[PDB]
Amino acid sequence: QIAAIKXAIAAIKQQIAAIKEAIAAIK
Amino acid sequence: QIAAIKXAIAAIKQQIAAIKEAIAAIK
Amino acid sequence: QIAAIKXAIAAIKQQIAAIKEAIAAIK
Numbered sequence A, B, C: 001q002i003a004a005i006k007x008a009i010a011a012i013k014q015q016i017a018a019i020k021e022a023i024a025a026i027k
Ligand SMILES: [Cu+2]
Pocket: A010
């Protein structure tokens, strides 16, 4: 369960980076 | 504590999906 | 490990709030 939480957070970090890039390009 | 972490991640997944939709509509 | 997961989630919550503000200003 703890390793699954760590994996989910790792995928979320990746999506956050992509979202910020997209918003940065617009701005 | 572990179940609280799982709940927080579930809410974050939901917000990520809504953010990507909004950015997708703009793009 | 559990406290590290809690810290990572706290930083993610902060980034989500900033992302939603930026998207809200655009919309
Ligand atoms: Cu990786």
